[PDB]
Amino acid sequence: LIAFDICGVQPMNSPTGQVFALRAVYKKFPALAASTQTTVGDIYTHFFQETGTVYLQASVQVTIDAGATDAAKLDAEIKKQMEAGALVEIAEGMATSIAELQEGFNGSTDNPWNEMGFRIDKQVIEAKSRQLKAAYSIELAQDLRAVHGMDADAELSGILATEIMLEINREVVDWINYSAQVGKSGMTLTPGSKAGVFDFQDPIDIRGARWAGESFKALLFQIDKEAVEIARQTGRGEGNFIIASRNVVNVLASVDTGISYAAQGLATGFSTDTTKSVFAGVLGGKYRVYIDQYAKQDYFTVGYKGPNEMDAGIYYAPYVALTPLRGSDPKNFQPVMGFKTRYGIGINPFAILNSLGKNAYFRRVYVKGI
Amino acid sequence: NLIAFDICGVQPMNSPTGQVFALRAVYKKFPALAASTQTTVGDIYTHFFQETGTVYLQASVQVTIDAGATDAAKLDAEIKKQMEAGALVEIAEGMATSIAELQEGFNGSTDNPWNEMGFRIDKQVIEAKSRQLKAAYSIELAQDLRAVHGMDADAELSGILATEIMLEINREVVDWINYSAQVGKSGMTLTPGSKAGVFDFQDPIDIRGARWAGESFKALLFQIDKEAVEIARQTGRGEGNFIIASRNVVNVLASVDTGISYAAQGLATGFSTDTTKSVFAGVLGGKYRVYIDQYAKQDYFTVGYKGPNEMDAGIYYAPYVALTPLRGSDPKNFQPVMGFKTRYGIGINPFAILNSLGKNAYFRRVYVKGI
Numbered sequence: 227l228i229a230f231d232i233c234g235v236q237p238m239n240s241p242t243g244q245v246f247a248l249r250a251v252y253k254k255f256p257a258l259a260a261s262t263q264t265t266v267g268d269i270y271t272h273f274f275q276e277t278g279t280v281y282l283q284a285s286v287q288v289t290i291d292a293g294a295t296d297a298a299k300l301d302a303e304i305k306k307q308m309e310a311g312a313l314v315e316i317a318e319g320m321a322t323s324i325a326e327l328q329e330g331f332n333g334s335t336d337n338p339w340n341e342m343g344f345r346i347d348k349q350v351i352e353a354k355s356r357q358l359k360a361a362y363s364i365e366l367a368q369d370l371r372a373v374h375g376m377d378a379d380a381e382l383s384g385i386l387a388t389e390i391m392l393e394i395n396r397e398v399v400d401w402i403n404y405s406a407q408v409g410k411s412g413m414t415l416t417p418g419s420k421a422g423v424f425d426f427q428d429p430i431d432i433r434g435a436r437w438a439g440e441s442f443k444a445l446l447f448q449i450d451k452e453a454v455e456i457a458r459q460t461g462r463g464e465g466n467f468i469i470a471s472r473n474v475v476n477v478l479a480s481v482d483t484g485i486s487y488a489a490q491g492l493a494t495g496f497s498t499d500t501t502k503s504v505f506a507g508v509l510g511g512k513y514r515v516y517i518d519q520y521a522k523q524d525y526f527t528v529g530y531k532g533p534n535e536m537d538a539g540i541y542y543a544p545y546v547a548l549t550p551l552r553g554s555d556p557k558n559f560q561p562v563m564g565f566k567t568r569y570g571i572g573i574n575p576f577a578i579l580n581s582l583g584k585n586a587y588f589r590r591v592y593v594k595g596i
Numbered sequence: 597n598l599i600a601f602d603i604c605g606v607q608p609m610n611s612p613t614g615q616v617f618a619l620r621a622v623y624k625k626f627p628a629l630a631a632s633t634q635t636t637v638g639d640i641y642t643h644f645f646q647e648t649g650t651v652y653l654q655a656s657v658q659v660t661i662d663a664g665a666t667d668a669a670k671l672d673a674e675i676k677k678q679m680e681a682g683a684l685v686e687i688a689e690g691m692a693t694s695i696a697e698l699q700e701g702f703n704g705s706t707d708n709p710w711n712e713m714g715f716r717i718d719k720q721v722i723e724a725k726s727r728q729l730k731a732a733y734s735i736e737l738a739q740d741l742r743a744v745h746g747m748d749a750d751a752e753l754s755g756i757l758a759t760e761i762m763l764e765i766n767r768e769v770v771d772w773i774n775y776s777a778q779v780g781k782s783g784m785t786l787t788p789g790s791k792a793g794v795f796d797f798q799d800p801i802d803i804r805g806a807r808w809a810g811e812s813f814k815a816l817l818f819q820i821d822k823e824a825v826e827i828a829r830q831t832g833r834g835e836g837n838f839i840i841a842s843r844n845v846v847n848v849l850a851s852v853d854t855g856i857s858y859a860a861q862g863l864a865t866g867f868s869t870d871t872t873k874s875v876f877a878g879v880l881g882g883k884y885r886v887y888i889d890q891y892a893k894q895d896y897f898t899v900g901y902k903g904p905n906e907m908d909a910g911i912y913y914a915p916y917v918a919l920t921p922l923r924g925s926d927p928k929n930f931q932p933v934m935g936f937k938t939r940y941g942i943g944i945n946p947f948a949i950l951n952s953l954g955k956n957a958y959f960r961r962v963y964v965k966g967i
Contacts, residue, residue, distance in 0.1 A: 240610075240615070242614070242719075242721035243613060243721070244612075350613055350721055350723070352721070
């Protein structure tokens with residue numbers, strides 16, 4: 227079992243070797259002053275002695291205290307007008323409004339041809355190798371067969387094949403968790419937050435929640451915030467998948483009823499086939515979530531994946547897989563079995579040191595409080 | 597119409613990116629001679645002279661070196677006399693080897709001294725780096741070339757341009773060779789009165805005291821052989837097999853050894869029937885296959901090595917695309933264009949373009965003055 231679902235693949239038929247990615251290309255509101263008669267719909271700039279500026283839109287036509295020659299007095303009158311609803315604040319949202327007006331209003335046909343906002347680019351990839359050995363005793367192999375009719379080395383080989391596939395999935399996750407930007411940061415901070423960590427015991431992070439029930443839902447809400455930031459930065463859309471620790475997955479599986487599948491048929495039949503190398507399911511109808519079997523502490527990462535082979539932000543491009551390796555160790559001539567694979571990986575360039583903490587397709591958050 | 601890379605490895609691409617291989621090589625207390633030492637024939641002693649450090653001296657004569665010479669100056673004097681007499685002979689690295697083998701051989705053991713083939717053998721990744729040209733021509737000529745000469749116009753321009761792009765890529769290869777080539781007439785290939793990297797025909801040292809051009813030209817060849825040797829030594833693959841050189845240098849080389857180059861006498865007799873000057877001139881001394889750098893910028897030659905294996909060149913070019921056409925016109929004046937694009941990728945034996953500049957052991961470049 228593999229999990230190369232949340233990466234592009236673009237498989238290789240030669241190392242070195244390349245992948246492609248659809249990389250994106252990447253106004254003086256008049257000052258408000260004493261005596262100013264604001265005009266409804268107009269916007270003024272006002273710097274408060276404490277906290278600095280906001281842009282204030284008039285809803286009410288009003289003269290802002292002509293006697294307010296003292297900035298402290300002017301701030302007081304303005305605050306009164308704000309309280310009265312006469313003056314309303316927005317910051318960048320108004321900067322956008324004025325920019326649009328100025329450019330449209332005084333615009334011209336000229337030749338403002340813009341490129342579509344996409345660079346579209348590629349990287350070179352080596353089909354980096356990975357390999358494991360079985361390293362096993364003769365007596366064991368003799369006994370597995372002699373004692374229960376087992377296939378001995380064949381089974382050890384199957385375990386080993388599973389392990390190498392797991393390591394590759396683990397590698398992909400490690401790179402995601404390397405390159406992902408740290409989430410619950412910047413655009414995704416709650417003002418009272420701890421920047422990068424979601425603490426299920428912290429009243430800000432849990433939005434005033436009570437017990438695990440509501441605290442758990444609050445995490446999913448942070449996940450949506452991460453998905454939004456991803457969408458914005460990549461220019462491609464909301465995060466489509468989540469990679470998370472077992473603690474987190476169990477938390478997320480406590481919500482969205484049966485979405486994270488327990489493989490309940492498995493439990494019912496007493497562990498008939500555990501297949502623990504797959505995605506649990508889709509949270510919110512939005513995020514396919516995968517379990518990081520090797521999570522080191524406790525965390526989750528939200529990421530985006532489009533339909534295009536070139537729209538993942540991370541690529542895995544297999545060249546060689548499960549090539550059997552066999553022989554013996556002459557020191558005692560004990561059996562050797564093993565598997566080799568070669569694939570190569572890559573990322574949206576985002577300019578590995580240009581991906582470290584920079585990969586716009588992903589946002590990583592540390593988890594505390596479960 | 598020729599690649600002029602018949603002296604290099606190709607390993608052509610089936611996709612850009614794209615790769616090449618190269619057969620990169622992997623890369624004793626002589627007892628001090630002292631006053632009273634009774635030497636024994638064939639034995640080797642270490643001696644530090646007051647002047648110019650040390651020498652290693654082998655006895656040819658079983659002689660005591662002045663037991664009263666407690667003064668290093670006296671010891672040196674006796675030694676010099678014994679050397680003049682032929683009793684003591686100086687060799688340096690040539691001795692280090694004999695002591696090492698005697699000691700190591702005699703005291704060796706079956707153990708596990710399995711030595712490696714002296715080769716690393718490795719690969720490089722190459723993008724199908726592109727180059728391109730346009731005809732940049734006018735319609736009024738196309739109209740009259742047809743009306744006046746009965747010429748196919750664009751067709752000839754296409755042939756010219758195709759020729760130019762091929763010549764330009766061949767030029768690029770030569771530039772990379774020269775870029776990466778080590779400086780010749782340097783280190784192992786210098787004489788005491790030498791100038792480090794340049795052969796000057798007006799310099800008595802470079803021409804080894806030659807009488808007129810005949811001997812001077814041969815002196816250039818002698819420097820070429822020395823370069824071929826240093827290449828052989830450093831690559832571990834053998835003497836340089838070819839030469840790339842400027843028009844002046846080639847004409848000089850072709851002035852000795854009678855028939856190294858083709859004079860293209862058929863061509864000349866027929867009054868330039870088809871010059872095709874994109875081909876190797878011939879073989880210098882029967883040893884080095886030599887090509888003319890028709891674009892040489894200073895005046896020079898480069899000696900280089902190439903084995904039969906494409907992985908044994910020191911430089912690689914993997915043609916992916918060649919002569920892909922361009923066609924259109926520029927509305928600013930509506931004048932037409934025709935053109936070509938190529939894609940290929942190049943490589944250099946790793947030698948660890950950062951590890952290529954002035955480091956490529958397969959090649960040695962020497963500038964030539966005074967021709």
